[PDB]
Amino acid sequence: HMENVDLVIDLQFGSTGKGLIAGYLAEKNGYDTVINANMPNAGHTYINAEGRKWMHKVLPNGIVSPNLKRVMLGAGSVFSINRLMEEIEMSKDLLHDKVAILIHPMATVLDESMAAMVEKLQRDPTNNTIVARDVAQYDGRIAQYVCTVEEWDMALMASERILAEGAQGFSLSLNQEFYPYCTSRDCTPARFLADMGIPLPMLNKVIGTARCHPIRVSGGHYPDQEELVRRVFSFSFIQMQKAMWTCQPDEVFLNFCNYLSPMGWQDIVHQIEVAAQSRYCDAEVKYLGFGPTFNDVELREDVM
Amino acid sequence: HMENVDLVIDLQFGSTGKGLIAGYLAEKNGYDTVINANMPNAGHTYINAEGRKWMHKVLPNGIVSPNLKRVMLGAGSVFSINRLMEEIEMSKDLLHDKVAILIHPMATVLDESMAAMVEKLQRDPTNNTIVARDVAQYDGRIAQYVCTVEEWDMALMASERILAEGAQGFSLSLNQEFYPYCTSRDCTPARFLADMGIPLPMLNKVIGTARCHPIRVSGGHYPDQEELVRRVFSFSFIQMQKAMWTCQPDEVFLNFCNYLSPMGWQDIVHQIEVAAQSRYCDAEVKYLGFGPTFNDVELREDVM
Ligand SMILES: Nc1ncnc2c1ncn2[C@@H]1O[C@H](COP(=O)(O)OP(=O)(O)O)[C@@H](O)[C@H]1O
Ligand SMILES: Nc1ncnc2c1ncn2[C@@H]1O[C@H](COP(=O)(O)OP(=O)(O)O)[C@@H](O)[C@H]1O
Ligand SMILES: [Cl-]
Ligand SMILES: [Cl-]
């Protein structure tokens, strides 16, 4: 019932490859429920051992789970039905009769991002075209997926193990120091759980994802980092401390280690752990990303 | 460092008298830090044993704490500087030199609510008049209180015991079934902690507040409840189950018991506990509100 939510969060600028560890964790743990509350994004990629690629902007990367029973798009979701239908059709095989795709009634339906989220907040009683409950009344494409709040809560209750997939990245948080060069929401576990309607006691663990060289999609960076519309930055220990403090991951996935010398990514493994420790976070780098595929995720304990 | 946040949340329509239990808990526990992220509201009232009244729309009711060291207005705060200054001046004595009032740099400054929250989300790089960091550059009134995100995190880190004061009420949640007849955000612990930038491991306990007869400030109600711009409703067990499920309070403050026969409020005590139990919530009604004052808060175990 409780402590059954593994929440994958990004500790930096949103391009740490959350999608990779989400897919990897889904395959390893076999979550019956996968959940997110994605707003429009460049996509989240997952590549399995067999080389099958999933580039999801809407659907959780966790849909690869062998025990997939429920696919849940949170209240905080801001999605294009077109994109959603495209992703469902592309994973048709994984989204069979025994897989329930639940769109939260209050998920924001994108017309044909900011204007959509704002229109939802406007709470215009006449506007029956912004939330999924309302759009589902004339758009049959989502009606089959759009559940009630009660059904949403009931789907979470009936979920054995849940993979929650946080969006963007911690430093892109609306209320982090880079404002207004940030996203429209906090990219913190508290906000993700809020946007997916996940009650706090359901949180099992936070899987924090990092890149050795964090990348920004023109935004502003941390003082202990420098540039190396993509802007590659050197690792920021301060970014990590801040991400550690707020996000408090239990486990860290350090990705794009393949782009650095052993000393390079190993130093960042140690830096992340120092940052975690410095911010009362028992987080340990457990997973290492050495490529975009399931096969490239290494247990940190096996490689260092 | 962690498990030091007592978060007072409202389980119904926002008029359960959260302010009363916040003030009561502040006096009993002596939190050095009191925190909220209030958007414009009708106010939160606290009356001490001596009869002193605090009607706060901006400041936490917890400022009454004998050990008050920090007063924190979260990133999610949407406040009038005028209202803030008025409340500070009225509690001047409680807000001495040894009390730091910290306004999150990303708190929304109300011009002279919806338009303010929206302007903040717009993230217009030219707009230096919406967030507290920016408004503090020309408005000295808040400059003295407006901290940096780092100082905000550092204030939470250095806090021994924190009273977090949730806003409005669970059924007023943006993503609860009453949408669009709801507030602009979820009124859930996850969202409150998100809006106050409180990392999830800092959560000690959730104090859920309820009224025997929930009141709506014209909105819609639960099917197991009926009406008895204020709309008084009979207790909704379904409302409680839903609030229990999401909010998962550890302790329940059942207020306005004074307006009901012993059997009336006692039945609701039992109903709340049944609702909690039915939704995997070990919540117990610990406090009973028999009036608007500190003296009127009773330990449930002492009266039934
Ligand atoms: N360690 C890695 N080395 C190289 N490419 C990788 C690695 N991890 C992921 N990728 C690729 O990097 C890109 C960005 O990752 P993606 O999942 O889309 O972003 P995010 O999940 O951070 O939003 C994808 O095309 C993905 O396949
Ligand atoms: N048990 C009670 N009986 C009578 N009046 C009460 C009781 N508890 C609180 N009040 C009063 O009810 C009003 C509403 O409470 P208030 O704290 O302002 O709302 P909330 O905290 O729910 O936003 C206040 O004027 C308060 O003094
Ligand atoms: Cl686990
Ligand atoms: Cl306690």
UniProtKB/Swiss-Prot annotation, chains A, B:
Pathway: Purine metabolism. DGMP binds at residues 15, 41, 123, 183. L-aspartate binds at residue 230. One of its GO terms (biological process) is IMP metabolic process. Belongs to the Caudovirales PurZ family. Its cofactor is Mg(2+). Keywords: ATP-binding, Ligase, Magnesium, Metal-binding, Nucleotide-binding, Purine biosynthesis. SMART domains: Adenylsucc_synt. Involved in the synthesis of the atypical nucleotide dZTP (2-amino-2'-deoxyadenosine-5'-triphosphate). Catalyzes the condensation of aspartate with deoxyguanylate into dSMP (N6-succino-2-amino-2'-deoxyadenylate), which undergoes defumarylation and phosphorylation respectively by host PurB and guanylate/nucleoside diphosphate kinases to give dZTP. dZTP is integrated into the viral genome instead of adenine by the viral DNA polymerase. This Z-base probably completely replaces adenosine and forms a triple bond to the opposite T-base. The resulting non-standard viral DNA is called Z-genome. ATP binds at residues 15-19, 43-45, 168, 255, 258, 291. Mg(2+) binds at residues 15, 43. This is N6-succino-2-amino-2'-deoxyadenylate synthase. It catalyses: dGMP + L-aspartate + ATP = (2S)-2-amino-2'-deoxyadenylo-succinate + ADP + phosphate + 2 H(+). It is an enzyme of class 6 (ligase). Its EC number is 6.3.4.25. Gene3D superfamilies: Adenylosuccinate Synthetase, subunit A, domain 1. PANTHER family: ADENYLOSUCCINATE SYNTHETASE.
